Amino acid sequence: MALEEFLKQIREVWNTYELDLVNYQNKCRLIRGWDDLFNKVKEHINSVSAMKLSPYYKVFEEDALSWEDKLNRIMALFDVWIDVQRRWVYLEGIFTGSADIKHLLPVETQRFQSISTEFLALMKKVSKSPLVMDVLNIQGVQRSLERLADLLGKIQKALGEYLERERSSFPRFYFVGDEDLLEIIGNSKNVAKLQKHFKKMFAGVSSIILNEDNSVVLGISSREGEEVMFKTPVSITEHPKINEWLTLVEKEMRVTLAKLLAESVTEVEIFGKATSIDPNTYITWIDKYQAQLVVLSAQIAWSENVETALSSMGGGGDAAPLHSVLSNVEVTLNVLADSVLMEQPPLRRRKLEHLITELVHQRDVTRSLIKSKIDNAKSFEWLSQMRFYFDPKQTDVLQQLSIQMANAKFNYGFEYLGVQDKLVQTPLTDRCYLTMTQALEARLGGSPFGPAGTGKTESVKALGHQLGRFVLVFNCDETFDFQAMGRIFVGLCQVGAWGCFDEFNRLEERMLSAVSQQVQCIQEALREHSNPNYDKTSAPITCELLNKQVKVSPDMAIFITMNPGYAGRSNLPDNLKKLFRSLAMTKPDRQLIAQVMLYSQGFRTAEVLANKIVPFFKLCDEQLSSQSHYDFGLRALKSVLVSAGNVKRERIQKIKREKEERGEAVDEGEIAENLPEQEILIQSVCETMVPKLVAEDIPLLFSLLSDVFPGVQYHRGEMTALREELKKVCQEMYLTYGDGEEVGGMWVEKVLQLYQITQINHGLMMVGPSGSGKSMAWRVLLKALERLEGVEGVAHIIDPKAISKDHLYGTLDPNTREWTDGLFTHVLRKIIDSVRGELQKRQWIVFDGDVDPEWVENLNSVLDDNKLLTLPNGERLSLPPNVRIMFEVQDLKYATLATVSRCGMVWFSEDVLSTDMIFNNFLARLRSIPLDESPMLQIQRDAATIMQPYFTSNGLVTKALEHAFQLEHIMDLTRLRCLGSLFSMLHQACRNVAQYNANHPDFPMQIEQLERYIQRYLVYAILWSLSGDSRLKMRAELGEYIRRITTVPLPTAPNIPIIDYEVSISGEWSPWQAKVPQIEVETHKVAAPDVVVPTLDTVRHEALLYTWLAEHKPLVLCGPPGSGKTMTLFSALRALPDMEVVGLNFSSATTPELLLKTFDHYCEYRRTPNGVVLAPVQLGKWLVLFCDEINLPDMDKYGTQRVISFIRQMVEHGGFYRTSDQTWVKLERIQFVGACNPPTDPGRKPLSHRFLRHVPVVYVDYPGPASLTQIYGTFNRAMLRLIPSLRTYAEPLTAAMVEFYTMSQERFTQDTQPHYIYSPREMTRWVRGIFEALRPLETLPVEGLIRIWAHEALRLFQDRLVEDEERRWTDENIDTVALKHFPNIDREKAMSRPILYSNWLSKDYIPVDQEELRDYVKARLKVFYEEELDVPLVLFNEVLDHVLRIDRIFRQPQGHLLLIGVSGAGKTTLSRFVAWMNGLSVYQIKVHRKYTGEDFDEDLRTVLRRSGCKNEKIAFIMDESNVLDSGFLERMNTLLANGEVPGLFEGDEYATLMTQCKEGAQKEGLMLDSHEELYKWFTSQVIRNLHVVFTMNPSSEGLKDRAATSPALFNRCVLNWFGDWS
């Protein structure tokens, strides 16, 4: 009864729970405490589910059921209200605090007044009764909240101009998006909400410090807790406007930094010119001032000391006080090194590290000066250095400090930078500093170029921070157009900030040329700012940006970092290149960056460690196997050195803890002296590099470690708690767990390596072949971390290539300049905002899919150390510390070095996930998860027990798979494809056993019968899964091998292969031939589209397809065109009444948009507590999306088919993403069947292995000569029953047919012409044509039958031929075949060469004389001239042949034509004449210069309306010249193949079409009311009435291109090669 007790507890909690309300400026009582309410709702929902788990639940089920509904409603309401409330808050602050908006924007001000009145009325109602249920019981409360949210969103979107004006007021607002700018402006009164926005407007100011009233700004703070206290605090009461006191805060920041720098310089002058420095005094001085201030003071003191020494030595013969400067530098460096050898606070530790770096640089410079015998302060060896001069006598504090390099002079910007990671100042950062400062003095930009991992982006940042500037890093891409770059320039010019545009060559060349104008005008303004003639008292320097006069600040600069070595990057125009000074940054000094980094981190042996670790990285680069995911560069050394520092700190802490818990004796010096720095460095190197290594490279790297670092061993930690959590998670997830060498030990080691990489890198890549355990690894790691650390783990899986890059990152509207968030941008922004506590959870964004530079190079700033998602609208999103960016990929063959270097790598091999692990997973799932949703569970357990011996190491299945991997398959063979096929078939076997038990309630299956059936079915499923996608020879080979290696009883037939046997439910092998009877087709059903003559292949493939479809498993039928894939699939689906099939016809231009249109037509999206679910409109029916050309869609330059990625995401993940609102949509009652030709066929691409893993492939080959003889002998016997005297000729005729077909299929192949494809489709058309000719006749001699046979052979096999010799061969071979199979006949009577048949001179289709036909056509042409078209035509024999062929096609249902010939040959005129003869109305699209896709859609709608609703027969004549875009061909392909375009009628057009269809059905007398029946009738009418005649020139490459762009032009259209006039 504990369920009842907990239900009563929940009832009492909700009856006592009230909304926590707090007053809001005496306007209303806003809801407070969203987190508690959400957590309570989630906990109660989880509890209710837990009770649903128990059986006793039933006695309370309904009540508990009722409860969840209320709970869900609560959540739903408060999933909106919070947002609404938040929005209203800031919107209120915009429409009340600001007075200019009422004059500027009155209409939506009144709108917001009305909505605010509604919101306050609702809040008053809530305040009257604060009960949660009472609020939930308000009538229409949910609808009211949704309407308020919609109206608030519209008003918020209607505030762009005000936001732009406010940005103009405060320039830093240019770096804040519209959402956050509205939040800042609205919440100006409540300053506590602005703290999270200061990081986007300032370099190092993450928050501001206020008093208890929050009315005076006392100072600023950084993200590390460092605080700067203002000398003159900023009062918010005196300056209520947000921008005014923000500007005052910025000015006071600069002034107080200058004053503190002056004080720090005055203090540090004591340490300078001092022989000995007390460590305590130096530490006190360091702690007193900020990091940038102490570094700047040290630089100023050293520069002044060197200047004084050089002035003293200016005499030449004087002494050398430069030695005094060097001695002072060395003494201070020794003090710093001693300080970092003991425990320090983290902020002071970073200050000491920065000071060590700066003083090492100073010592090197002073040693160089002494070695060069420098005695003059004007020597360029001293002038080329960066020298800091302080003038305390300057009245302006902002001008007291000057930084000079060569002739370049700069003023410190005094921007608060916080604590920035200082860069070792190597020789190339000195060359970079010199070149960039020379560019700045010339008022030019800087362009450091070179490979990636050289220092280009950081050296720019380090130079900007050295000058105290605000450096903004922008990750450029092709979407940074002229306007976005111009607005960014406006922001930078007004703020006075440095703009570092990395990957600048990723812009379009035209965009680079356009932006050159803005760069040039900006530089001209800066140059006129530099001239001393200008006075700041006059008008400020302004420039022409975006048709506006924008003030230019002297501190502004533009830098572009690019790698010109990447192929496919834009070439900068020379007029743009001349605006930048370029520098080659190719070889960083890795030896010095290490040495200095290890020296500053506290390593006593830093020089030895660096000299051992840099050559070690070179050795790893040049000795390990070359892999695409290997990176041994600078971003990988700095990743190792930082980890070494962290590991040394952790080891010191551990040693101190051990000393504390074992006696009381702690000494920093003793620990520092007795510390294995070698072992620490090796541990970091291993933890960083081992996960990326392949199996063969691990011993090589460990041998390299032993060679370079002898005597030190890497003993990895035993993470016992994490391993226990992993074991529990694997146990509950049916996954195999192993320790060390046990089964699964490699996988668990990979999981632990992934965990280690997560802690070091915020960007990860799990690289490995399909089915290597990557997904399971990171899922199990996430769950184990959630259970261990107690932090909830949320994973957002994004397929980056299943959607366009615009849908992935976002779109800037070229007209209104409005930003629409993409998928990744929306997810990241939602995490950053943390409206629902997303910052307290472990967020993992997994980019599962293909990686190419186009989409992933936008993530360079994210996966770098900028951790910024830079958008073209100037917005920058900081990556939260709890967010990991993950890439689950199968290869990195297209990713560049920049991507590989920025991320940690974990390499999963196919050996990591052994086959025993997969077998164990399958058996555990079978024994645990019932198949129905227990007799079914018992059946599964017994079957799993029976299959246990074969699912072992070196078992039947393993040996069979190993052998099958050596065969030849129509598609690339992967282990998991075969294993999934086998597992689905075994599930079908268990379901068959359950069905047999249900059919025999009294006598169920016993143990021995079950064993026999399961063993035989296991052999059968192994055969059909490991060789289903291979020819008959390979199936026989696999059967023979299994017979060799198995102990299961097998059929004893001497020569019949095992593939010809099925397993009956009685536990015995039975031949498939027993299910293939000699049927007798009805005469009226001869060669009908839905008539299938059963054969061995037909029944076998039908059974296999039923097995795969009943499991709702996506499947693929691969085979030659016309083999019978669609026929077999439809015949198999006929046995599944609860499955409705929808046919899609893929082409080269197919995108996921076709699938989305099909979903919008046949399915619906519904909102459920678990999310959005897309399900078919029909209830209880499964939608089968049959895609006919899955491997045709275009593969980009990076080897990815977007629609294939979409289908793979929808199968593997069970859903997709709606890009309208970036919402995960889960598929329900939807499965996938695909059909394709072999990938070796022209225009066909090999499907991805990740996609092929989820889809079993069955190879449907052409029926053999015996199979063809059987099928078409049955058809001919059925057909010839019309004329009894011809019945005895049924056997020979078929043979002749088959023979000729074979001959043609051997003579004309795709090598000659692309359209030379002969299939059983031609034989079916042959039978259909002969039957149609013979149907009206009451009697006919054999000669007439042979004449009809020859005529149909000519029409089917000769009309498509290009050359004359081919047609002559066809004529001669028809004659020879007919004489061979029909001897003793009148040769001349049945083979007079003008074989013409027509129904124009009679009621029936009988042979027609050429002269009589010519006279009749002449008369009809006279009538045609006098009525329709007065263009006289000369009649010759080929014209008669062509008009007869066109009439034949026009008399067929869904009869489309493809007339190929030279222009002016008469194709269009003859088509029009024949259509007029047959009564068809000719429709041609009037294409002009402004004809677009919308016009073609309208014309298609008109044609479909006329031919489907009005029952009008229409000949739609279309020429290749009418095709202006590929969308034309896509819609034409869909219409030709199916008879209906899925997305053509939408919106009110669909309603009008439905009304017209209802009217037409009423006219026809049909009772149709439902939209589905109306659309089916419309499609049938369009199929029966519309004849599309496509005309094109006989181009060589054009025909091959069209064979893939529009496949239905060669499968649904009868091809007639008119050619040129002979």
Partner 1 sequence: TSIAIGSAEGFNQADKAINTAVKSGRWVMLKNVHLAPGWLMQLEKKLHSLQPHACFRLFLTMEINPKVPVNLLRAGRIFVFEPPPGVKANMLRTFSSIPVSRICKSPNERARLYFLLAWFHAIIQERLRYAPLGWSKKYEFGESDLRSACDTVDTWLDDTAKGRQNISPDKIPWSALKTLMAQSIYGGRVDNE
Partner 2 sequence: PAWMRTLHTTASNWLHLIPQTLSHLKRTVENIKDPLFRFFEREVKMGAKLLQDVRQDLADVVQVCEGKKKQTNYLRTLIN
Ligand X SMILES: Nc1ncnc2c1ncn2[C@@H]1O[C@H](COP(=O)(O)OP(=O)(O)O)[C@@H](O)[C@H]1O
State yes or no: 1320 annotated in a binding site.
no
Per-residue x/- mask for partner 1, residues 396 to 435, rule CB under 8 A?
A: ----------xx-----------------------x--xx
**If binding is defined by CB under 8 A, does position 749 make contact with partner 1?**
no
**If binding is defined by CB under 6 A, does position 1095 make contact with ligand X?**
yes
Q: How many residues bind partner 1 (CB under 8 A)?
A: 34
State yes or no: 1466 annotated in a binding site.
yes
Closest CA to 1020 of 949, 960, 945: 960
Stretch 457-516 residues interacting with ligand X (CB under 6 A): 457-458
CA 716 to CA 691: how far, in whole Å? 13
Stretch 720-749 residues interacting with ligand ATP (CB under 6 A): 735-736, 744, 747
Tokens linked to 1522 = 């009418």
Stretch 1401-1440 residues interacting with ligand X (CB under 6 A): 1431, 1433-1434, 1439
Q: Among residues 336 and 784, whose Cβ is nearest to ligand X?
A: 336
- Give me Rg for the CA atoms of the chain: 40
Q: Among residues 424 and 767, whose Cβ is nearest to ligand X?
A: 424
Q: Among residues 300 and 1271, whose Cβ is nearest to ligand X?
A: 1271
Tokens linked to 1132 = 């198999």
Question: Quick one: which of 513, 1151, 1223, 1452 contacts partner 1 (CB under 8 A)?
Answer: 513
Q: Among residues 904 and 1263, whose Cβ is nearest to ligand ATP?
A: 904
Positions that interact with partner 2 (CB under 8 A): 619, 622-623, 625-626, 699-700, 703, 706-707, 1239-1242, 1244, 1311
State yes or no: 345 annotated in a binding site.
no
Write out the H or E segment, with its range, that includes residue 402.
strand 401-405
State yes or no: 177 annotated in a binding site.
no
Closest CA to 454 of 484, 432, 476, 437: 432
State yes or no: 1503 annotated in a binding site.
no
**If binding is defined by CB under 6 A, does position 1271 make contact with ligand X?**
yes
- CA angle 1128-1130-1135, nearest 5°? 100
Q: Is 387 exposed, middle or buried (0-12, 13-18, 19+ CB in 10 A)?
A: buried
Residue with nearest beta carbon to ligand ATP:
775
State yes or no: 1047 annotated in a binding site.
no
State yes or no: 491 annotated in a binding site.
no
Stretch 749-808 residues interacting with ligand ATP (CB under 6 A): 770-776
State yes or no: 1125 annotated in a binding site.
yes
Question: What is the 3-class SS of 165-205, one letter each residue?
Answer: HHHHHCHHHHHCCHHHHHHHHHCCCCHHHHCCCHHHHCCCC
DSSP 1248: P
**If binding is defined by CB under 6 A, does position 1382 make contact with ligand ATP?**
no
Stretch 573-632 residues interacting with partner 1 (CB under 8 A): 573-575, 577-578, 581-584, 586
DSSP 945-1000: HHHTTTSSTT-HHHHHHHHHTTS--SS---HHHHHHHHHHHHHHHHHHHHHHHHH-
Amino acid identity for residue 297 in this structure: S
Q: Is 413:398 a contact under the CB 8 Å cutoff?
A: no
- CA angle 1230-915-1117, nearest 5°? 35
Chain centre distance of CA 410 = 46
Smallest distance, Å, CB 1245 to partner 2?
Answer: 8
Smallest distance, Å, CB 513 to partner 1?
Answer: 4
Tokens linked to 541 = 């320097």
Residue with nearest beta carbon to ligand X:
1466
Residues constituting the chain: 1622
Smallest distance, Å, CB 388 to ligand ATP?
Answer: 55
State yes or no: 625 annotated in a binding site.
no
SS3 376: coil
Write out the H or E segment, with its range, that includes residue 1586.
strand 1586-1592
1123 binds, among ligand X, ligand ATP, partner 1, none (CB under 5 to 8 A by kind): ligand X
**If binding is defined by CB under 6 A, does position 1465 make contact with ligand X?**
yes
**If binding is defined by CB under 6 A, does position 638 make contact with ligand X?**
yes
1560 binds, among ligand ATP, ligand X, partner 1, none (CB under 5 to 8 A by kind): none
State yes or no: 774 annotated in a binding site.
yes
Amino acid identity for residue 924 in this structure: A
1212 binds, among partner 1, partner 2, ligand X, none (CB under 5 to 8 A by kind): none
Closest CA to 219 of 192, 191, 250: 250
State yes or no: 402 annotated in a binding site.
no
Stretch 408-447 residues interacting with ligand X (CB under 6 A): 423-424, 426, 429
Instruction: Quickly count: other Cβ atoms within 10 Å of residue 565's Cβ.
Output: 13
514 binds, among ligand ATP, partner 1, partner 2, none (CB under 5 to 8 A by kind): partner 1
Closest CA to 559 of 472, 452, 431: 472
Q: Is 35:837 a contact under the CB 8 Å cutoff?
A: yes
CA 1041 to CA 1026: how far, in whole Å? 12
Instruction: Quickly count: other Cβ atoms within 10 Å of residue 1024's Cβ.
Output: 24
CA 1065 to CA 1495: how far, in whole Å? 60
State yes or no: 568 annotated in a binding site.
no
Q: What contacts 531, CB < 8 A, 6 or more positions away?
A: none
Tokens linked to 670 = 């003793």
CA 1058 to CA 295: how far, in whole Å? 83
Pairing of strands 763-767, 548-551: unpaired
Q: Among residues 904 and 1263, whose Cβ is nearest to ligand X?
A: 1263
State yes or no: 1126 annotated in a binding site.
yes
Smallest distance, Å, CB 591 to ligand X?
Answer: 11
Q: Among residues 264 and 385, whose Cβ is nearest to partner 1?
A: 385
First to last CA, the chain: 95
Stretch 1247-1306 residues interacting with ligand ATP (CB under 6 A): 1250, 1253
CA-CA-CA-CA torsion sign (396, 401, 404, 410): negative
**If binding is defined by CB under 6 A, does position 909 make contact with ligand ATP?**
no
Q: Among residues 394 and 438, whose Cβ is nearest to partner 1?
A: 438
Smallest distance, Å, CB 702 to partner 2?
Answer: 9
Q: Among residues 675 and 1465, whose Cβ is nearest to ligand X?
A: 1465
Residue with tokens 């034509």: 1457
1538 binds, among partner 2, partner 1, ligand X, none (CB under 5 to 8 A by kind): none
State yes or no: 928 annotated in a binding site.
no
Question: Quick one: which of 384, 1151, 1481, 1556 contacts partner 1 (CB under 8 A)?
Answer: 384
Per-residue x/- mask for partner 1, residues 1261 to 1300, rule CB under 8 A?
A: ----------------------------------------
Pairing of strands 1613-1619, 1456-1461: parallel
State yes or no: 654 annotated in a binding site.
no
Closest CA to 1456 of 1527, 1523, 1538: 1538
Per-residue x/- mask for ligand ATP, residues 836 to 875, rule CB under 6 A?
A: ----------------------------------------
Residue with tokens 């362009």: 447
CA-CA-CA-CA torsion sign (1314, 1316, 1320, 1322): positive
CA 841 to CA 35: how far, in whole Å? 13
CA 706 to CA 685: how far, in whole Å? 13
Smallest distance, Å, CB 1246 to partner 2?
Answer: 9
| Residue stretches of the annotated binding site for ATP | 450-457, 768-775, 1119-1126, 1461-1468
Q: By the criterion CB under 8 A, which residues form the site for partner 1?
A: 379-381, 383-384, 406-407, 431, 434-435, 438, 442, 450, 481-482, 508-514, 516-517, 573-575, 577-578, 581-584, 586
Q: By the criterion CB under 6 A, which residues form the site for ligand X?
A: 423-424, 426, 429, 452-458, 561, 588, 593, 634-635, 638, 864-865, 1092-1093, 1095, 1098, 1119, 1121-1127, 1235, 1263, 1271, 1320-1321, 1324, 1431, 1433-1434, 1439, 1463-1469, 1591
Q: By the criterion CB under 6 A, which residues form the site for ligand ATP?
A: 735-736, 744, 747, 770-776, 890, 913, 917-918, 920-921, 976, 1250, 1253
